[PDB]
Ligand binder design. Structure first.
Ligand code: UTP
Lengths: 154, 315, 38, 124, 21, 52, 49, 49, 394, 51, 97, 74, 290, 58, 117, 54, 52
């Protein structure tokens, strides 16, 4: 307790210092000053959005690169999560990363969660078919237009 | 190895050693350093500031009507940073003649303040008559309610110091908290001139009153001009005021006090010519200002001087 | 009023604490501190 | 942290409920007046006093033991014993402990001293 | 070198107040 | 700063960390004449003739 | 209204509207005056820093 | 007095002569130049007043 | 302390100010000399001479340099800019204000702005701010006008206001009257070339410094000057200010100015209402925010007051009277009228508000219920655009 | 209501397209990413796989 | 009748009254200063005579001159970024919005 | 006089926490890279060699301060 | 109308919608857009505390040079910069210094732009101009000062200033590092003798004994001084840590101090302090709470 | 000119070490730094441009 | 273009690879012998913005997500060379519009045929 | 409805007073309390409606 | 103060060494939903508890 409040006169004692003053650690209560701002906070909180007063401390989190790094370091190269192609000669930069699912598997329900025998090959061929459909699209001028309504798209 | 030591930046046998960074390691910066950001020093030059006005600014506020109307009279009086050489007799004649024609109080008094300032720079003695003729009646006499415009007061005070005049003490006194409360609005140069005059005239008591007010009003002590502090302190021969001045001397800063000593030792010294009126001998106050300086500076070790006579004892 | 009352209380307590000191110690004297030699 | 004569006169006329002014004067032979709103814990007892429970302290000194949040102003003849006492109060961790130097001598114009210590060092 | 200046006179600061009161 | 191995266990950053660059760059002033603004023109007559 | 005394302006405005002494822009003039911008000046300089 | 005022030199000896130990620190490349940005108590007070 | 005599230099060197290489005690001196900063010689020479006098006077007047300054002034008045600048080079001491005045005045007719500016900036904050002068700034401004340079006009205005350091510490601050004159020609230029922004800025400054009536004050001032040379008492009254020819004549014109404001506004309203439709007349023009003016003098002043009264209208009608020395009110009436109108128009925010063009009304939207584009949204339709349809909320 | 198509994947999220159609799903994703500026015509680099 | 339990009764009554008057006077100056209150620290004031004994401006530290004796606790705490806490320098205190 | 006897409520709630690092948490120390020393050569008056491990040395330090010393694969 | 709606949305901190309205305007009504929509957006982004947007909009407004920026615009942008500069980051980024001060260093660039744009710099509030003038004196210096700013007299004067304020910790010349940080052992070998390839001075918070290993609050309960042995040390370290407890006392203490009325309680675990106490005599009633 | 061959402004930073690998690795460091800062600035400018393209007065 | 980018990379605190449901309870495994069973989390407590009491994924030991505004990088797709479908609003004003020859004669959605029709 | 409108004006006036006070009072701001803003509201402040008569 | 919270954090970091990244499914929507028992036929009964 002595450490906390030794000669301390008020909780706002050290707030002559800007970087201490907008610390959000103890709460947001010293940063709300006029009614207007308080009401605004109420509103924004009820709508389920962020408090603007909360932004008084800038928190960059840990960047995704740093996270992935700590993971692969803690796992000593994390070989469970690497594609088997990482283990073959001269992997290109896409074999160099972890195993996340991409958007390409999304419409194929034949393979359920465990794909049975030959299913994954079938899927692989479907995927190819689509890549070629895209190629034809680009070739002949029919590709998605960012503006397009439903009849146009049809 | 030698009488000439290695210089640690240019020698690879220092730089690349085990106690420093070898050239085959990765060469990045070790830690960041924020010095200037954490604790910053305020700027004080060793040299005084080159553009500063260095005088008592008299604050000319005139309505831009009488300013045009009175121009051929005012052109003879000081404008900003310009000091026309017109003889003071002429200027006072012009005020006496033309001023009753002007109806404004504020204008008549700005004009008067210019006249006073002009007569302060030439050191003409017959200008206080103007104070007794116009101002004295509604400002200084018989508890008159009226409160003089600041610029006028500054001007008259400045005149009483430039021409050393007993009168100042009466005016100054009216400026404290119960009176006009003008004292906190004084310039540092104002204080400087006041102290110097009072010192020449030799009032310990004037010196004390003034130092007390300066301190209470939070004047800029360290930038009060050293010459004038010295001439003021030099005037102090009375036991009680003397006591006061020791205790007070602790209000200056380290640097200020060192140059109080330097300036003091010069004005009774080599630079005795620098003064229009020679200093008067205070051996006591001189010795004391030197002593004070010595107390407040960092102390150096000269062991052959201290222990010169030391003999050990087996008792 | 309160100051009067509280003054008297103060001396009552001083009186008793002193009497307790003299009683338990046995004499009215005390040692100094190790630093009162100098 | 210090408390000056001004603060002392102010607190004489305008007391605060939870500010305690504690008299540290050691010898009863030397103390003839009463600093207003003060209480008596002589310096010699402090180390013991501050280790009593609230109740026990009440029984030994006859007044309530200040909580550790409250302002505690210490008092002595010169301001020496009040200082040492202060160190005691600070070591039990009391958050506001002020010593009033020059204390009872300045208040009452007495010249007394807590300890006899002289400025002159005996030649080595 | 101490004392630098004469100590404050013996004046009693409490008396005038409690006398007014 | 969270990296406990920094020089001790042999980890030395290959790239200087953002936070450090910010501190370094925030310590020193910027020279005014580096900002390079000319909207008037070149002074043919007076500029090269200015006070000694 | 410009100094923020709306209370005192209300009855005056009422009585004007009743006599049909106000026309198009006049209303806009009053409604704009309700924003107190002589009070706004004072607040801006002193309070709101 | 001040406990950060601390001996930077060793006791004078022949070890300063007979050895390649350096007599000063090498300059620190990343420590900025010290310069003056900052104000007095007096100045802050003047501004506030 | 060492001091060099440039008259008395001898081989013997009696004062011993030279840096002797081999004497007793020399070494630390030599080392000091080798550490000196890039301008050391020059700076010391310049600061040990050339410094502000104890009175606050400038070092500017010296007997040995006087004829040179005279020659510079003379050269600049005959308009020889290069010869003058070439003599300015050989000046050892700070040159008097008169030199800077002459030199910039010379820069005006050929429009040289860069040169006027480098002159001014040379004399200011290098040489102790000799250059900061009502008159010098005035010339600077007249060049910026002549060069049709907007940003530099604002820059000269800004310099003229100054900052704490030059106003309070240095005490070189432009005279009140001069400030007024400068701001005024800057304002003429801006209002005439329709720059609402900078115009509004300078005008707000004139409002803040209580300079709106200043020209009148100056005229009153002159008559007062004559009355004092004659020996009669002078006074400043509202009556004396309304006895001025300026205020009389502006008061005379005011109804005509109002009627022009009204005619102009009407025609603007009409145009905007037509452009609304892309061209008949839209409902927009049918009733506008401007009330019709009653038939009387006081009705005119009242009307001006309540529609245009955030600006000070009277003083604007005064300022717009003269153009390039030509009095417009007493020679070209309609040119003057249109000018005063256009200025009062530009200087009011109220007028800006009531002159706006009707804009189309922006539809709010929600995202599609069956998501296809994030870019395609369901628009809201105001009951005007879809009649029928079930009743909807806002 | 937003949930009009819910039956087609019952209890899983609502989709405005036929999710049982691989091609149509992949196409729908294409259009989404085109709408948001992730996909579309961009100035080529020497690294982008020109072949 | 139970005054003497309260802080406005007895010996503390005089304090309350004092606090009362100060508040009044203080309200006055706030109304004069444009309803932006003066400094708590009384940094705002012309004269040293004016700042009250109750102000936080008053310096209570073991030592006036010696910096190492100017702490609150046993060692010298630092603010974020190892900035000095105990006695702040003029420019470290920023009054911003 | 006394009208009453009461029980002394107080609100001791700590709800805010301000902890400030003492200065010495940020003071410098001397840190070093550390590898296994494969060998050492000292020379001042007379040269002396110690070999702990014989391998191809990938790094070599030279240090001149009192005695010449060479730390091999250090 | 639209600029008032934007100003409303932006006081609310609703940036998406404010920016939408401006977009629609830009697209259909562009020739009518005044500065006050940019003002609205600036004020708004500053409220939502998005300073990169506050910046984006200013830079844009400098590119299109029309509508003309107003002193109010410059004021809002500058304020947003000061706001940015005074926000703290979280504790992870706070170990060395307060980063966000770098933002103030934008200021002398913005001021230069204000001159290119014809925004008079003397219409800025007294308040803002104080903050800006401060920001300036941190980062701006001229080519003049720059030639002279490294003189040793000024460097050492700065040191002297720091010495009179008792903060020498960071200064280079003036600090002597003492403590060395030992190597980490391996269970792969006790045998391998490690040696230092390189040495760096880095703050102690990188590696410091984990808070659960070291005694509880050290600063408060222990008085520690790092000092040098006077005696000749054959081998081992020339510095040691003299640590005593805050509460430490001579084992002989009771003799070293005057006698007290407590002394006859010597070596008694639960004394009845009620009995030796004075309250029982002082009070008439004396209820003993125990 | 288009693509790589044209610009408004060119900066060349000439880095100099005492050892070749020093200067090589410095160049990688500084290079990656300017890549990030450059992308940030140029992206900002790009949004300003896209807005000016969308519309504006003269 | 990962599947559920928002939910995983932007939404989740670990970026999906930190396991937030783990007990800090003591393990009999040799590597984990240093691990000590943790006291339960403090009840009404105010954390520092970068930490949490470590109860759930929604409340990690270490808060990875920034508290600022998040914005997807500005698309590198050319907006000036891309031609979208003609809108109503654009086609009403088609007579004032300035296009490229490619804008008038564009392969998909040519605007010249519209200016004419 | 009219009565309700009037009453609501009264209550708002009360709360307004409270707000001006809190925003200008720096000592109360020193203790950092969101609760200062809610502990006295229209219900609580004076004049009280059920006290009108007396 | 005893720093047991800091310990707890550190130990969490230690426990991370072991763990895998979880399988989130090929169709992730479907997977999440089925874990929650929402889709059709995905309903699990609560585990039968032995009465007390
Ligand atoms: O600090 C200084 C330095 C120099 N001087 C110079 O010393 C010269 C003679 O030195 P004095 O100081 O005796 O003259 P004074 O009182 O009449 O001068 P003022 O200060 O009243 O003007 C003065 O004329 C002035 O130029 C000072 O007055 N003060």
């Amino acid at each position: 307790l002595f450490q906390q409040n030794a000669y301390r006169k008020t909780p706002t004692d050290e707030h002559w210092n800007p970087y201490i003053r907008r610390s959000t650690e103890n709460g947001v209560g010293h940063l709300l000053q006029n009614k207007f701002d308080i009401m605004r906070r109420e509103d924004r909180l009820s709508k389920g959005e962020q408090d603007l007063t909360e932004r008084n401390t800038i928190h960059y989190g840990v960047p995704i690169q740093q996270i992935v790094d700590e993971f692969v370091f803690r796992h000593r190269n994390a070989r469970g999560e690497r594609p088997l192609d990482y283990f073959k000669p001269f992997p290109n930069f896409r074999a160099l990363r972890l195993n996340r699912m991409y958007r390409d598997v999304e419409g194929f329900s034949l393979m359920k969660q465990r794909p049975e025998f030959l299913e994954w090959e079938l899927f692989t061929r479907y995927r190819q078919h689509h890549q070629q459909r895209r190629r034809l699209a680009l070739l002949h001028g029919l590709e998605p237009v960012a503006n397009e309504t439903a009849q146009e798209r049809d | 190895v030698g009488y000439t030591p290695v210089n640690p930046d240019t020698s690879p046998m220092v730089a690349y050693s085990q106690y420093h960074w070898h050239y085959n390691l990765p060469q990045g910066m070790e830690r960041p350093h924020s010095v200037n950001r954490t604790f910053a020093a305020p700027f004080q030059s060793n040299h005084s500031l080159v553009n500063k006005y260095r005088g008592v600014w008299i604050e000319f506020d005139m309505h831009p009507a009488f300013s045009v109307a009175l121009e051929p009279q005012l052109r003879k009086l000081p404008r900003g940073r310009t000091l026309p050489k017109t003889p003071a007799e002429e200027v006072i004649a012009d005020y006496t003649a033309l001023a009753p024609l002007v109806d404004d109080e504020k204008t008549r008094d700005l004009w008067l303040a210019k006249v006073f300032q002009h007569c302060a720079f030439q050191r003409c003695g017959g200008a206080m008559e103007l104070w007794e003729r116009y101002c004295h009646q509604r400002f200084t006499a018989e508890g008159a309610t009226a409160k003089p415009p600041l610029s006028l007061v500054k001007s008259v005070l400045f005149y009483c110091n430039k021409t050393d005049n007993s009168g100042w003490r009466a005016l100054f006194d009216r400026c404290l908290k119960d009176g006009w409360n003008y004292t906190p609005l004084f310039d540092t140069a104002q204080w400087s001139f006041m102290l110097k005059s009072i010192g020449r005239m030799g009032d310990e008591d004037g010196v004390r009153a003034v130092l007390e007010e300066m301190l209470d009003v939070q004047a800029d002590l360290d930038r009060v001009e050293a010459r004038s502090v010295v001439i003021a302190l030099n005037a102090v021969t009375n036991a009680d005021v003397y006591e006061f001045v020791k205790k007070y001397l602790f209000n200056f800063g380290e640097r200020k006090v060192k140059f109080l000593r330097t300036t003091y030792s010069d004005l009774r010294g080599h630079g005795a010519g620098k003064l229009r009126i020679p200093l008067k001998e205070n051996d006591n106050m001189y010795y004391h200002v030197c002593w004070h300086s010595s107390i407040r500076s960092p102390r150096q070790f000269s062991p052959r001087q201290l222990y010169f006579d030391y003999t050990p004892s087996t008792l | 009023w309160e100051l009067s009352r509280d003054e008297q209380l103060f001396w009552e307590r001083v009186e008793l604490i002193r009497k307790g000191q003299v009683a338990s110690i046995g004499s009215s004297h005390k040692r100094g501190y190790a630093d009162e030699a100098a | 942290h210090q408390v000056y004569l001004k603060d002392m006169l102010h607190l004489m006329r305008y007391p605060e409920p939870y500010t305690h002014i504690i008299d540290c004067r050691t010898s009863t032979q030397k103390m003839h007046r009463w600093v207003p709103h003060s209480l008596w814990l002589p310096r010699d007892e402090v180390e013991y006093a501050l280790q009593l429970s609230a109740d026990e302290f009440l029984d030994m000194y006859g007044f309530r033991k200040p909580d550790k949040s409250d302002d505690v102003i210490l008092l002595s003849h010169n301001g020496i014993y009040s200082e040492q006492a202060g160190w005691e109060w600070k070591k039990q961790f009391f958050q506001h402990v002020y010593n009033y130097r020059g204390g009872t001598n300045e208040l009452f114009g007495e010249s007394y001293s807590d300890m006899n210590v002289s400025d002159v060092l005996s030649p080595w | 070198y101490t004392p630098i200046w004469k100590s404050d006179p013996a004046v009693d600061n409490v008396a005038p107040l409690r006398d007014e009161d | 700063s969270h990296r406990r191995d920094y020089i001790r266990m042999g980890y030395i950053p290959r790239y200087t960390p953002w936070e450090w660059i910010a501190i370094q760059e925030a310590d020193q002033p910027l020279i005014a004449e580096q900002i390079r603004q000319d909207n008037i023109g070149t002074s043919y007559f007076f500029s090269l003739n200015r006070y000694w | 209204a410009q100094h923020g005394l709306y209370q005192q302006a209300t009855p005056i405005v009422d009585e004007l509207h009743h006599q049909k002494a106000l026309h198009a822009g006049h209303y806009a003039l009053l409604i704009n005056a309700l924003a107190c911008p002589r009070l706004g000046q004072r607040i801006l300089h002193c309070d709101a820093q | 007095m001040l406990s950060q005022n601390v001996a930077k030199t060793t006791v004078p000896s022949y070890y300063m002569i007979r050895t390649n130990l350096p007599h000063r620190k090498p300059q620190n490349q990343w420590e900025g130049v010290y310069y003056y940005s900052g104000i007095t108590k007096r100045q802050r007070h003047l501004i506030l007043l | 302390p060492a001091v060099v005599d440039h008259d008395n230099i001898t081989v013997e060197d009696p004062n011993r100010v030279g840096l002797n290489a081999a004497t007793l005690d020399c070494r630390g001196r030599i080392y000091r000399w080798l550490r000196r900063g890039p301008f050391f010689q020059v700076d010391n020479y310049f600061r040990r001479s050339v410094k502000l006098n104890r009175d606050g006077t400038l070092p500017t007047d010296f007997v040995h340099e006087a004829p040179l300054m005279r020659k510079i002034i003379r050269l600049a008045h005959r308009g020889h800019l290069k010869a003058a600048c070439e003599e300015y080079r050989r000046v050892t001491t700070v040159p008097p204000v008169e030199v800077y005045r002459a030199l910039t005045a010379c820069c005006v007719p050929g429009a040289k702005l860069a040169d006027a500016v480098s002159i001014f900036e040379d004399g200011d904050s290098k040489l102790f701010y000799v250059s900061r002068d009502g008159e010098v700034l005035h010339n600077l401004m007249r060049c910026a006008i002549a060069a049709r340079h907007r940003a530099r006009i604002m820059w000269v205005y800004n310099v003229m206001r100054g900052r704490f350091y030059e106003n309070v510490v240095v005490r070189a601050e432009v005279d009140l009257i001069w400030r007024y004159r400068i701001a005024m020609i800057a304002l003429e230029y801006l209002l005439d070339h329709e720059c609402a922004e900078e115009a509004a800025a300078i005008y707000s400054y004139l409002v803040e410094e209580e300079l709106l009536r200043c020209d009148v004050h100056v005229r009153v001032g002159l008559h007062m000057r004559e009355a004092i040379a004659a020996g009669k008492p002078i006074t400043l009254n509202n009556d004396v200010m309304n006895a001025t020819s300026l205020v009389r004549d502006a008061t005379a014109v005011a109804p005509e100015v109002a009627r022009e404001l009204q005619r102009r506004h009407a025609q603007t309203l009409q145009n905007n209402a037509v452009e609304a439709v892309g061209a008949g007349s839209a409902p927009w023009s049918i009733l506008g925010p401007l009330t019709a003016i009653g038939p009387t003098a006081e009705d005119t002043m009242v009307w001006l007051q309540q529609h245009y009264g955030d600006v000070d209208v009277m003083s604007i009608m005064r300022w717009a009277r003269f153009r390039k020395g030509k009095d417009l009110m007493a020679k070209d009436r309609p040119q003057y009228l249109a000018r005063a109108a256009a200025w009062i128009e530009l200087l009011s925010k109220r007028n800006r508000e009531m002159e706006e063009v009707p804009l189309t009304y922006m539809r709010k939207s929600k995202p599609l219920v069956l998501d296809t584009n994030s870019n395609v949204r369901v628009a809201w339709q105001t009951p005007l655009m879809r009649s029928g349809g079930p009743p909807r909320l806002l | 209501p937003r949930n009009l198509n819910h039956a087609l994947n019952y209890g899983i999220a609502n989709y405005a397209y036929n999710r049982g159609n691989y091609v149509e799903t992949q196409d729908s994703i294409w259009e989404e990413q085109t709408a948001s500026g992730q996909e579309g015509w961009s100035p080529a680099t020497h690294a982008d796989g020109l072949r | 009748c139970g005054v003497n339990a309260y802080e406005f009764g007895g010996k503390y009554a005089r304090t309350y009254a004092y606090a009362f008057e100060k508040a009044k006077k203080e309200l006055e100056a706030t109304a004069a200063s444009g309803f932006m209150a003066p400094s708590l620290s009384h940094e705002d004031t012309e004269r040293l005579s004016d700042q009250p004994t109750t102000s936080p401006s008053v310096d209570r530290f073991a030592s006036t001159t010696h910096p190492e004796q100017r702490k609150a606790q046993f060692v010298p705490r630092v603010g974020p970024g190892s900035t000095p806490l105990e006695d702040p320098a003029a420019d470290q205190k920023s009054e911003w919005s | 006089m006394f009208l009453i006897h009461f029980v002394h409520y107080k609100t001791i709630l700590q709800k805010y926490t301000f902890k400030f690092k003492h200065i010495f948490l940020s003071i410098d120390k001397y840190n070093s890279l550390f590898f296994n020393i494969s060998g050492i050569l000292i020379w001042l008056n007379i040269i002396h060699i110690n070999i702990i491990l014989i391998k191809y040395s990938f790094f070599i330090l030279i240090n001149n301060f009192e005695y010449l010393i060479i730390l091999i694969s250090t | 109308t639209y600029e008032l709606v934007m100003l409303a949305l932006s006081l609310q901190g609703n940036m998406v919608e404010a920016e939408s309205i401006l977009s629609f305007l830009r697209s259909h009504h562009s020739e009518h857009i005044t500065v006050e929509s940019f003002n609205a957006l600036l004020l708004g982004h500053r409220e939502a505390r998005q300073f990169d947007c506050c910046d984006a909009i200013w830079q844009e407004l400098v590119d299109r040079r029309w509508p003309r920026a107003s002193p109010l615009t410059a004021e809002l942008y500058l304020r947003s910069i000061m706001d940015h500069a005074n926000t703290p980051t979280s504790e992870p980024l706070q170990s060395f210094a307060n980063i966000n001060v770098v933002e103030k260093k934008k200021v002398p660039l913005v001021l230069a732009q204000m001159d290119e744009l014809g925004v008079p710099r003397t219409h800025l509030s007294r308040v803002l101009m104080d903050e800006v003038e401060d920001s300036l004196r941190k980062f701006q210096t001229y080519r003049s000062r720059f030639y002279e700013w490294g003189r040793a007299v000024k460097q050492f004067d700065f040191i002297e200033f720091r010495r009179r304020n008792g903060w020498l910790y960071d200064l280079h010349l003036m600090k002597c590092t003492t403590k060395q940080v030992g190597p980490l052992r391996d269970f792969n070998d006790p045998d391998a003798v490690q040696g230092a390839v390189a040495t760096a001075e880095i703050p102690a918070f990188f590696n410091e004994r984990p808070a659960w290993e070291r005694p509880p609050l050290e600063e408060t309960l222990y008085v520690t001084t790092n000092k040098e042995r006077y005696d000749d040390v054959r081998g081992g370290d020339i510095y040691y840590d003299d640590t005593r407890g805050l509460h430490d006392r001579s084992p002989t203490w009771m003799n070293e101090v005057p006698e007290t009325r407590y002394d006859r309680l010597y070596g008694v675990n639960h004394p009845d302090i009620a009995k030796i106490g004075i309250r029982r005599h002082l009070n008439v009633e004396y209820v003993n709470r125990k | 000119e288009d693509g790589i061959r044209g610009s408004e402004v060119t900066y060349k930073i000439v880095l100099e070490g005492f050892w070749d690998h020093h200067v090589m690795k410095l160049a990688e460091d500084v290079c990656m730094f300017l890549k990030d800062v450059g992308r940030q600035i140029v992206e900002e400018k790009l949004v300003a441009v896209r807005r000016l393209l969308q519309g504006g007065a003269v | 273009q990962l599947q559920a980018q928002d939910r995983i990379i932007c939404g989740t605190h670990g970026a999906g690879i930190v396991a937030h449901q783990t007990a800090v309870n003591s393990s009999d495994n040799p590597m984990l012998s240093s691990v000590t069973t943790a006291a339960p989390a403090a009840d009404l407590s105010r954390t520092k913005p970068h930490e949490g009491t470590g109860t759930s994924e929604r409340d990690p030991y270490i808060r990875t997500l920034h508290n600022q505004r998040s914005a997807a990088p500005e698309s590198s797709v050319s907006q000036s060379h891309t031609v979208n479908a003609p809108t109503v609003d654009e086609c009403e004003m088609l007579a004032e519009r300035w296009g490229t020859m490619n804008y008038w004669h564009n392969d998909t959605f040519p605007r010249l045929v519209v200016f004419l029709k | 409805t009219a009565l309700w409108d009037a009453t609501r004006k009264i209550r708002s006036a009360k709360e307004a007073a409270l707000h001006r006070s809190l925003s200008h009072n720096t000592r109360m701001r020193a203790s950092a309390d969101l609760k200062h803003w809610y502990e006295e509201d229209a219900n609580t402040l004076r004049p009280l409606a059920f006290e009108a008569l007396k | 103060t005893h720093g047991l919270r800091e310990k707890e954090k550190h130990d969490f970091t230690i426990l991370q060494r072991t763990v895998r990244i979880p399988f989130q499914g090929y169709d992730m929507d479907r997977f999440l939903a089925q874990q929650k028992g929402t889709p059709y036929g995905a309903q699990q009964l609560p585990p039968n508890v032995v009465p007390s």
